[PDB]
Amino acid sequence: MTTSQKHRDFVAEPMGEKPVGSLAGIGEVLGKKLEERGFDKAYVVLGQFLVLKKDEDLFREWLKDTCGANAKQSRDCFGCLREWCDAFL
Amino acid sequence: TTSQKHRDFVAEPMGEKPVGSLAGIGEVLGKKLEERGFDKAYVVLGQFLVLKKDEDLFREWLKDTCGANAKQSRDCFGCLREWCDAFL
């Protein structure tokens, strides 16, 4: 297992009302910036991932533009949402 | 009350179901959703979630996007709301 424990916690169960900082890659700095843009709960970021048809390039670019995520952070967040979807959607 | 199409949708994960599997989304609406990129049910779920599950704004967006009338948008909203309560 190469993922963070944090990723594994997220993908292990439905996300319900979890905050955006429960997503892998989304530390407190990125999470504050996402919340200030209206992306307060993880499911709102899931929504964007889904409206972008789960496209890695568009989602990671959107995350960079919206909260300044770097490549590792956007990869981790994408991978967490992708694996969550594979398990639960 | 509810249609069987609604109950069938809310009973299980949606996976790669087409947009027409959503309650209220018939052939005409599905066509116009697909023309706009919303070809699978999960893409419309995505919009529902980005709008924070807000009934008024989601139903208005659906009317604006594909021409859904009030019953169609009611049906579609309700199926996504109940799916989310069961699976999200």
Secondary structure, 3-state, chain B: CCCHHHHHHHCCCCCCCEHHHCCCCCHHHHHHHHHCCCCEHHHHHHHHHHCCCCHHHHHHHHHHHHCCCHHHHHHHHHHHHHHHHHHC
CB contact A58 to B (< 8 Å): no
Backbone angles phi, psi at A24, to 5 degrees: -55, 140
Which residue type, as a one-letter code, is found at position B41? Answer: A
Q: Which residues contact A19 (CB under 8 A, 6 or more apart)?
A: A31, A40, A41, A42
- Name A4's Cβ contacts closer than 8 Å, sequence gap at least 6: A24, A76
**Rg, chain A, Cα only:** 11
Tokens 């594909």 found at: B66
User: Chain A residues with CB inside 8 Å of B13's CB?
Assistant: 88-89
Question: In terms of Cα–Cα distance, which of B49, B65, B33, B64 is closest to A89?
Answer: B49
CA B57 – CA B4 distance, rounded (Å) = 26
Q: From the CA of B69, how many Å to the nearest CA of chain A? A: 22
The experimental method is X-ray
Asked if the Cβ–Cβ distance from B43 to A50 is below 8 Å, we say yes
Cα(A84)–Cα(B18) distance, rounded to whole angstroms?
20
Q: How many residues does chain B have?
A: 88
Chain B interface test: which of A18, A37, A48, A89 (most B C-beta within 10 Å): A89
The full set of domain ranges for chain A reads 1-89
A31-63: buried (b, 16+ CB within 10 Å) or exposed (e) per residue? Answer: bebbbeeebbbbbbbbbbbbbbebeeeebbebb
CB contact under 8 A, A50 and B52: no
DSSP character for A39? -
What region does B17 belong to: left with phi over 0, alpha with psi -120 to 50, or beta? beta
The resolution, in angstroms to one decimal, equals 1.7
Q: Which burial class, exposed, middle or buried, applies to B21 when counting CB atoms under 10 A from its CB (0-12, 13-18, 19+)?
A: middle
